[PDB]
Every structure is written in structure tokens, then in C-alpha cells.
Design a protein around this ligand. Sequence first.
Ligand code: 8P1
Ligand code: 8P1
Ligand code: OGA
Ligand code: NI
Ligand code: ZN
Length: 331
Amino acid sequence: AQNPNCNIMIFHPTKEEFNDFDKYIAYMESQGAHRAGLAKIIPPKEWKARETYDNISEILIATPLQQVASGRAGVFTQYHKKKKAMTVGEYRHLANSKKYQTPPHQNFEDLERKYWKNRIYNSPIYGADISGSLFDENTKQWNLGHLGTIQDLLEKECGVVIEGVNTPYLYFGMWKTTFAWHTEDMDLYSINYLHLGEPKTWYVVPPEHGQRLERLARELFPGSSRGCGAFLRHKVALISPTVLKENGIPFNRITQEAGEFMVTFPYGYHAGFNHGFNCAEAINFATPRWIDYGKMASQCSCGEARVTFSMDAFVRILQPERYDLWKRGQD
Ligand SMILES: Nc1ccc2c(c1)CCCC2=O
Ligand SMILES: Nc1ccc2c(c1)CCCC2=O
Ligand SMILES: O=C(O)CNC(=O)C(=O)O
Ligand code: NI
Ligand SMILES: [Zn+2]
């Protein structure tokens, strides 16, 4: 078996290898990349997402989110307080202000230490889930707005035609902005391109060990667990690497820098934080191997999760027994 220790693998495709997206994902899996839950892909030197990022300041962040923490330094939840709209130019200025700017630090490890020590005492503002793309329409390779759709994948694999669309989302981050422990909707893959700015550090649990993380989460957030059998779907819980280690949870970590792609694999729990002002673009996607994960994906039916229109068809076709209960949750 390839990659039995479930290490995060890093790939350096040639420009020829970068032509066929599906083929390269399959190649990465043939090398065991999926066992980690996360892979890094460094694009060939000849490739670029777009010409420059000089003209992005007028993009609107309609609903910036202030991420307010509760709990202890290594075990906390965050809730999102809506703030007034601001442009990317305004957001960048805010990120760089004394209140929000990245502190002096020696290296990524030093910054990681500072993050886990001090995150809860601040409330950074995140521009998340903004529908759009920064890939040039003429970028033919690994253009996140030009991927085969999940609806077409489901149709190709299972013969059923379904409604729904899936398009990319932009994320504008600043120091300490945080993504909580989660897998993707319907345990899909995700792909994330860091377009510009400071790094993003990721933590990931191998898919074969996801239930170990779930069990610890139930222990650490007992009220939340009683409220919902899939409360990690709410995307609000954080657990530090120190606490994971103390509890014997298998995980890995890696830092993504501008110009790099990360792929998360079905049922690969991940969490992380931004180092400073940055912009990432991400989208969910599927492959034939995903179908079995989609069929088995846990669902939130307590009403907290609240998912996109397109998830309806996924649950309806892949999980017909769960559909009625889940749909009651959406309404
Ligand atoms: N349009 C703006 C300008 C500044 C700010 C906001 C919106 C909300 C976040 C806090 C802030 O300084
Ligand atoms: N796709 C995700 C997953 C987690 C999170 C976000 C988007 C933004 C809101 C905060 C968070 O933890
Ligand atoms: O970048 C972020 O804030 C969160 N991204 C993801 O969880 C992802 O790409 O799957
Ligand atoms: Ni994700
Ligand atoms: Zn729930």
C-alpha cells in the first residue's frame, strides 16, 4: 500500500502533466496521496493563474465576518459576527493596521506558536465564501472556474441527471483568521489555490482516522454533541495540535504559500489559519472514488449547518433514506 503512514505529499507536475486535471488527481491517488487527507501541488514554472493582482481592490466583501472565540486556547469555538461591507482595498488596509497585522516572528513555527497561544484573545475579520474567480479566462490548466462539475460527475457515474451548479469561492484573510475542523459537504474533495499574500497553515487528519477526531470532538464539545450528531458540520470547533497530540489523534500539518494548490480528499478533516493578508480561491469537486464517500457522509439535520442549493440533489440521490430528515433541517 502506498503512503501507509499517511504523510502529506507534495507534487511537482510538469507542464504536460498539468493539462489533464482528472488524470493528475488519479495519479496522485495512485501514489497514496489521499491517505493523508491533503496534498500540495506546486504548478510548473511556466504556469500562471492570471497576469497580475494589481486591479483587485474594487472587489466587494459584502459581509465580512468577525471571528469571535470562546473557550480555552487549545479548545475553542468561534462564531461569526457580520460586519458592514468593505472593498478588498479597504480590507487589505484593515489587515495591515496595527490592530490586525501579523506580529514580528522568526519563522512559520514561531508564528504557529503565537497563533495557538493568542488566537482566542483577538477577533480577526475574514472575507469568506465570496462567489467569484480570479483565474484569467485564458488560463487553460487548473482553472478552478473551469472544472468538470459534480453534477456531471454524478451523471457520468450513476446515470442520473440532476439540477445544481457549483462555482468557486474567494477568501480574503488576515492574521489569525481561522477555518474550523471540517470535512467538505457531502465529503467531497476540495481544491484551494492561494492567489496572493501571506501563507495559510493547514492541519489534517487521515480519512481512515476521521472517526477518532469525531470522538475527541464529542468529548471536548459535549453540549454541541448533544445538540447535533454531526456538529462538526457547523464549522465552528477548533482543537490545537497540542491537544490532538495529547489525545493520540493522528494528524499532519503543512504551510501553503502563494502560488500553490492544496487538495483535500474525501473525509479528510482539516482546519487552519492565515498568516496575514491573503486571497485564496476554492471549489469542491468529485471523482469516481468520491461516490462511496458521498453515500456514507454524515449530515447535520439540526438546522445549524445550512448548505447550498446543490446539496439537495446529492442527498436526494445518494442518501434517499436520510433525505426527508435532512430536508426538514434546511427548512
Ligand atoms: N467599509 C468598511 C470600512 C472599515 C471597516 C468595515 C467596513 C467593517 C470592518 C471594520 C472596519 O474597519
Ligand atoms: N469552507 C469553510 C470552512 C470553515 C470555515 C469557513 C469556510 C469560513 C467560516 C469560518 C470557518 O471556519
Ligand atoms: O481557506 C479557507 O479558509 C478554508 N478552505 C477550505 O476549507 C478548503 O479549501 O477546503
Ligand atoms: Ni475545506
Ligand atoms: Zn447540526
